[PDB]
Structures are given as C-alpha cells and as structure tokens.
A = this chain, B = another copy of it.
C-alpha cells in the first residue's frame, strides 16, 4: 500500500476470515511499530467520527479525566488512543507494538 485506510484492512481481514476462519476464531493480533499504531488510531478515529447515530459521552470513554493539581480544584486531563476495532462477524483487531519494527 501507499495510502492506508481502515476500509482496506477491514475488507482484507474479513474476506480472509469468511473464506478461511470461523466467527469465533477471527481475532487478529497485528504486530507493527508505534508509527503504525498511530496510523491505526488516526484511521479508527476518522471512522468513528462518522458515527453520528451515537453520541460518545466522556463518562464511558473518559477521554477527559479528573486529576489532582494545586492550580485548581477541578483539574482535567485530556487524551485517548484507539488500539482495537471490531468489524462485524467476529472480526477483531488487536495490536502488539514491537520495537524491532
């Protein structure tokens, strides 16, 4: 590939899984480098940003969190990362960032 997408590997993973795997055994533990883990996060995000039928409350995602500080009594954090995806029919996706990459 030259341009990477989640549509791309979601299709690849599923076609392989439909042809070759059963629904329960379609978990895929990808091995990659940090710079692909961020590419993954970006694309998973770009995909979720189109989920307008759902409102992602922070009480469940906790992208923003309450932290102790001396600067304020309600001191807040911010930050999240997408490390998985669940395509239909049991297709899962999990990462293992190995420095060898």
Residues of A within 8 A of B (CB): 18, 34, 37-38, 41, 44-45, 47-49, 51-67, 69-90, 92, 95, 97
- Asked if residues A77 and B86 are in contact (CB atoms below 8 Å), the reply is yes
9 tightest A-B CB contacts, nearest first:
A79-B86, A72-B81, A77-B84, A59-B60, A54-B56, A74-B80, A69-B83, A75-B83, A58-B60
A81, B69: Cβ atoms closer than 8 Å: yes
How many copies the complex holds: the figure is 3
- Inter-chain contact A77/B71, CB cutoff 8 Å: no
Verify A54–B59 contact, CB threshold 8 A: no
Inter-chain contact B84/A44, CB cutoff 8 Å:
no
User: Do residues A58 and B48 form an inter-chain contact, with CB atoms below 8 A?
Assistant: no
Using A48-B53, A49-B53, A53-B49 as known contacts, say yes or no to A86 and B72 having CB atoms under 8 A apart. Answer: yes
B residues near A67, Cβ cutoff 8 Å: 83-84
